[PDB]
Design a protein around this ligand. Structure first.
Ligand code: 83Z
Ligand code: 83Z
Ligand code: CA0
Ligand code: CA0
Ligand code: FE
Ligand code: FE
Lengths: 679, 675
């Protein structure tokens, strides 16, 4: 029983189903493979096409999943899609009314076309199963919990008909107890509010990071006009006929004006974030109080995108409403894609479930066999120096104890947004200045936001207040208080209100990462590291060896540890050996606008990425000429000869484009097919 | 007492308030000027910036209105804006949350900035009056009716709070009787359905033109699921939570697929149009049946964008519900801008109203005086031959009787969408083949589209069934039946269902055009002409003399009659003497995407117009290089030297860009300030 789970939209690599398809139209595309009821592989398409939360069809994700399973496409018994067919097709139909030149291709025909063209797979119609959206969520959240029954709450922006759903789960049976309609969306409320902070889709976590800096009392009575808690776990959100945003009209009427790009957060902005976070907490605890009492259940699984609000999750943990709480590492739509595979297996009879509670999110493609890794790092030699220590973990622990910030890349990439010891950046958690330091190091701007700690299972209760319910901490799903007498010791990872989003690593959840944190604890007396994701501000979490080396060379980390190899950048890295390649969305443009007296105006050159929200950058006439000659095989240095050679100015210009990922820059060739490592 | 009426958004000529600001965000920007209660000038900005139904701030329209009134900015006593301040600002604020780089400039600051930078006019806060949207519509529609009491119905997509409002009007006082909420919008319903036919905003009257070719039975029971008529003049529209379109989910579930652009209109599409039109007719007549008997009014004024549904209007006319019906030539938001002037005047003193019923929409800028027109036509000499007949109307009537298709441009341009004898294309109304060809060859549009007739007031009842209420036909507001015994005679202007959107012209509504139609009737026996708007498919109604001549030369017209000059295109016209100029929205781009094996793709070159819904076109590398040198003063022939001379291929390529209006091509200089 080999079942593929699919979520996302249907766009090709280089174009979208309609031009500039909005970033929220079926996002976080991913592919998941289950076999005999176990999740054998899962990866988000964003890791492979390098577009954060991409909506594009997850063709590469499917290819990677089939290879991790040793399967041909034709081996797949069924395909589950995370929305009902009529809903996705009606939304596509609406996009087609807005773009009358777009050919009428609905979801079943598009899925069949992408798989046939992209993999030579003729998918028979009877193998494609469409699934109710919150049902897919609930299966993913509950089947990995290891509980034999639970109350299951799903909250997100919306499924086909609901913004929230409540189930009772028993064995492999879901029974729906309640639902909440689309206009009551809490994910909708949170995203509406996020826009008022100069932020957008995918920035909700930054708003949650900002909330503890604010006073929730300032706007408490304003938000109280936008919701009413009601009897029997009900609630209302009070809409308006002015604009498609629940929040902006009332706040505008009271003089609140939205933050502009590059403007610093005012006290009003911090307070707004606080009252927003308090509002959603109050509503969800209202829901859960009613359904805990009504169902009588002591266990909760919480899924949907709203369940990535780890602040909310820590409040649920401390509420005493439940004895146990489980949250999946991918509770957003990538996890609904996984859940859609289980629902498809159930639809076709044979629903087999995982034998254990999920402990490791390490489920994507690996970096490769060590012989092809060694070989590929040699291709990077003009830019890096490599050491091959005898005990890389031991060396890494000492470097960390000496105060260096490390890139840490091992094995299979994490499913879901948190890095957990496979595509991570780690450093000493004690020094508070590591916050400003490592933020500048990776060109990010979340200094207001602390980093997440990782602690050994053994030491976990020596530093963190896990009490209340028994929650799962292998994925940083919960904010917990830092013990008051350890707060000053844990300066980099403790928030302004004394809390932290802790990963508890165990020998079972991640053996190598556990050994690393334990070893550092032996060396310093503090078995706590900070653990942030391995990516700069212009990319999702790095996936391949080439991605890892690129991100290392374009950030200011001290050392990279990748599959026992110690990597450092040469004193003068030779960019000229790198072969530039366009990404499928790269566009290179010379533009003339209108000028004064109706002349042809200013003539500028730019590079940009052709997707909704994609970045763009000005380029010099010289680099424009160089990049226009990119052929995918000639090196940057050889291409630069046509404009006089790779000057220091050009190399610096190229490097800044590299940092923003406008195009691929890597040595010639590639690492080759990922090795069958026998696991 | 001089009052400016304003409507539209606040964008500059070359950018929008946010990038790619949607075409429906405060559209049909216009300016109107009233003086002592009379409308002295009105023009839509689309005529001046050449962007159909533009949302850009109507800066040119204000300047032109002041010139027509002989006024300086400082003479203006007040400025009315056609929406309440809190509503437009809340929408602006929403756009600013989606575009965090946009500075927080709201409507009051934006209006004052545009008038200061654009006209040197410092507008005091106390002179800017914001007006409820349907109130503005109602003043415009009622005060021009010549009625001293009436029921006034406003139906559009939405105002600030309502999709529909019903007023009692008596003297100069409006009293609200009823309103209908935003989700009951009939304008929204019609636009939602328009999108299923491969059309967009602005195409509603094409759907209306399609409907008589369909059978409303096919989809009658489908549309019946989308609305319910209720007691005492009420109704409901039944929404959905799947997509922001009332119509498309149900019709998708029943197997109806949206038409693609550039594909035929099938019988299912025609049937869909017919059932939509019947649906809106049923709802509006339900509303009006109730409010006619309840309010006790024998006379109706109907405004809002829905009142440009001339089929609906003709049914209202035949319903027997009213004795008289009036519809303003600009019943869409440009007319709400005019109404906002009357409201602003009412808020700062007693309201002065027009003395008489409006008979003429000839209210925009004229073409110029005789001397400057003749001199400017001399600038076009390398492209045109010009004759100066003793009696140009006599001559034009003869050319029409001989089968010629004429451009006709005289005096001040029409306010509102219909051409009425000031910026018109006219032809013999008798041969059905004229409809076939003027659709296919001249306007280049769909073969199903009707053509509208103009008839003399003296002969109107010889050809059209005007029975029922007394409606005003000076602006083609009403579809009426063509008398059965005249349908064969009027082959080009009788629609498939035997009706026509008639203009009745009189010596009082348009003396010159009436003389033309009457003389044609004396020559042929038939005092009826085909009258379509003077524009190709890439442009709004032509405004200036250069606009008129450019449009004549790029559409297949036989002859142009412009202010008594007979213009024909030269045998071999010299495009090399035209001076290319960029429009403020013209853009030129050389572009590479990705190519095979992650290479840079092959370069392509394009010209496009930078606004939401703007066209684009590929251009040769040679023309790309030529257009990059455009300076606004050098001729096309001189510019082409740098690419080795204006070859035949380059002239042909340039001509096709000119026809789509990607750039301005006109002789050196301009006509000067209009005399
Ligand atoms: C212009 O056309 C629209 C616009 C909206 C709605 C719909 C349509 Cl057709 N109609 C739907 O049905 C939405 C659909 O199901 C969908 C994209 C679901 C994904 C998988 C959710 O994850 C997204 C969200 O929840 C999102 O916030 C992040 C809310 C977006 C609402 C909107 C973007 C408003
Ligand atoms: C994404 O942001 C939106 C979107 C919508 C609505 C609003 C907002 Cl903020 N909220 C409004 O209030 C609209 C406002 O009042 C307005 C533009 C009024 C003009 C003058 C009307 O003429 C337009 C129409 O009637 C139009 O179809 C032609 C309907 C468009 C509705 C929409 C395109 C849906
Ligand atoms: N079908 C569907 O809706 O997709 P989905 O399961 O992937 O959840 C996305 C939603 O979770 C919301 N969301 C994401 N992070 C959030 C956070 N930290 N707090 C609140 N809401 C959040 C986000 O704003 C968005 O509304
Ligand atoms: N504030 C506001 O809404 O502006 P507005 O007065 O300018 O009218 C626009 C509305 O008239 C509708 N509309 C335009 N032509 C129409 C037609 N022939 N039939 C029905 N609706 C029409 C159009 O679809 C749109 O919904
Ligand atoms: Fe979801
Ligand atoms: Fe209106």
């Amino acid at each position: 029983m080999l079942v593929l789970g699919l979520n996302g939209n249907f766009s090709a690599a280089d174009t979208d189903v309609v031009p500039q398809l909005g970033e929220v139209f079926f996002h976080d595309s991913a592919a998941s493979l289950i076999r005999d009821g176990e999740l054998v592989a899962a990866v988000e398409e964003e890791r492979l096409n390098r577009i954060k939360k991409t909506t594009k069809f997850p063709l590469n994700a499917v290819r990677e999943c089939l290879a991790l399973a040793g399967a041909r496409p034709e081996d797949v018994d069924a395909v589950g899609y995370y929305f009902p067919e009529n809903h996705i097709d009606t939304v596509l139909n609406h996009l087609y009314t807005e773009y009358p030149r777009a050919p009428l291709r609905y979801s079943r025909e598009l899925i069949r076309q992408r798989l046939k063209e992209g993999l030579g797979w003729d998918l028979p119609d009877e193998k494609l199963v469409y699934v109710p959206h919150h049902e897919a969520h609930a299966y993913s959240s509950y089947l990995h919990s290891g509980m034999d029954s639970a109350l299951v709450l799903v909250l997100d922006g919306r499924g086909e008909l609901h913004s929230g759903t409540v189930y009772r789960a028993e064995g492999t049976r879901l029974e729906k107890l309640a639902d909440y309609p689309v206009p009551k969306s809490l994910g909708g409320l949170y995203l509406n509010a996020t826009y008022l902070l100069g932020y957008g889709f995918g920035d909700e976590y930054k708003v949650m990071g900002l909330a503890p800096w604010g006073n929730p009392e300032t706007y408490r009575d304003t938000f109280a006009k936008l919701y009413t808690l009601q009897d029997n776990g009900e609630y209302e959100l009070h809409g308006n006929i002015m604009v498609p945003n629940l929040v902006s009209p009332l706040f505008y009427a009271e003089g609140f004006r939205p933050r502009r790009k590059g403007e610093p957060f005012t006290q009003a902005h911090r307070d707004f974030a606080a009252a927003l976070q308090e509002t959603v907490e109050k509503i969800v605890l209202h829901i859960l109080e009613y359904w805990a009492k009504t169902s009588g259940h002591s266990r909760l699984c919480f899924g949907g995108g709203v369940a990535h609000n780890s602040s909310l999750n820590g409040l649920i943990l401390k509420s005493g409403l439940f004895d146990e709480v489980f949250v999946h590492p991918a509770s957003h739509d990538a996890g609904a894609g996984e859940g859609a595979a289980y629902a498809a297996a159930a639809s076709l009879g044979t629903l087999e479930r995982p034998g254990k509670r999920l402990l490791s999110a390490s489920l994507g493609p690996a970096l490769g066999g060590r012989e092809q890794i060694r070989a590929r790092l040699a291709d990077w030699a003009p830019l890096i120096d490599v050491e091959f220590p005898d005990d890389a973990v031991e060396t890494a622990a000492g470097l960390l104890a000496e105060g260096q910030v490390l890139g840490w890349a091992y094995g299979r990439s994490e499913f879901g947004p948190r890095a957990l010891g496979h595509r991570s950046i780690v450093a000493d958690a004690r020094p508070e200045e590591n916050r400003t330091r490592i933020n500048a190091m990776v060109k990010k701007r979340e200094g207001f936001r602390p980093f997440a700690p990782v602690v050994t299972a053994e030491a976990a209760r020596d530093y963190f207040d896990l009490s209340g319910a028994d929650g799962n901490h292998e994925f940083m799903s919960f904010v917990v208080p830092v013990l008051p007498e350890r707060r000053t010791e844990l300066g980099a990872v403790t928030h302004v209100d004394g809390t932290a989003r802790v990963q508890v690593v165990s020998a079972e959840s991640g053996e190598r990462f556990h050994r690393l944190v334990r070893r550092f604890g032996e060396l310093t007396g503090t078995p706590v590291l900070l653990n942030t994701s391995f990516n700069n501000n212009a990319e999702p979490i790095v996936q391949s060896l080439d991605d890892v080396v690129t991100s290392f060379l374009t950030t200011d980390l001290d050392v990279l540890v990748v599959e026992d190899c110690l990597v450092r950048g040469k004193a003068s890295p030779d960019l000229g050996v790198l072969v530039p390649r366009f990404r499928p969305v790269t566009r290179l443009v010379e533009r003339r606008t209108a000028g004064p007296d109706a002349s042809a105006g200013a003539k500028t050159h730019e590079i940009h990425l052709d997707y909704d929200g994609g970045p763009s950058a000005k380029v010099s006439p010289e680099l424009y000429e160089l990049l226009g000659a990119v052929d995918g095989t000639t090196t940057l240095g050889d291409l630069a000869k046509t404009v006089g050679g790779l000057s220091d100015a050009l190399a610096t210009e190229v490097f800044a484009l590299w940092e923003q990922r406008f195009l691929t820059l890597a040595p010639a060739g590639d690492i080759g097919p990922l090795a069958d490592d026998g696991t």
